[PDB]
Amino acid sequence: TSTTCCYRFINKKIPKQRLESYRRTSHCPREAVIFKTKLDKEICADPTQKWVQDFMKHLDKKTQTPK
């Protein structure tokens, strides 16, 4: 999971319904959020964008944290 870096970020908000999970990602030349969709696409997003932060919170809240 520490084997790739984001080069460019998506320009527009991803529809919330398409999202399955996310990961982060100094090391890389840019800190990044990588969303994974339900069709298993990985999408680089700008962690400085408000919608990215909101979506991470939403995905955190969707599952109970184990143990």
Partner: protein, 84 residues
């Protein structure tokens, strides 16, 4: 849905400085060609070799420079390794 053609995570290797450099200068992304900017330091390693390389082992990696999406060889090397 249009995610764009430059938004896919791109393979890297890590060197002795814990600063990553990209592997090659192009890959397929969401049906398109995802290219790094000209001049970007890159490792002249093709994707299939990078897929197989021993993780976390130091190799001597050939260094190059991106030119129109191809990692052109600079005949220089540095140690690098692939993450977990």
């Amino acid at each position: 849905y249009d995610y764009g053609t430059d938004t896919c995570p791109f393979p890297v290797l890590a060197n002795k400085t814990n600063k990553a450099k990209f592997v090659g200068c192009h890959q397929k992304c969401n049906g398109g060609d995802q290219k790094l900017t000209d001049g970007t330091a890159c490792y002249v390693v093709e994707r299939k070799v990078w897929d197989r390389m021993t993780p976390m082992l130091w190799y001597e990696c050939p260094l190059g420079e991106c030119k129109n999406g191809v990692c052109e060889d600079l005949r220089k090397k540095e140690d690098c390794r692939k993450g977990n």
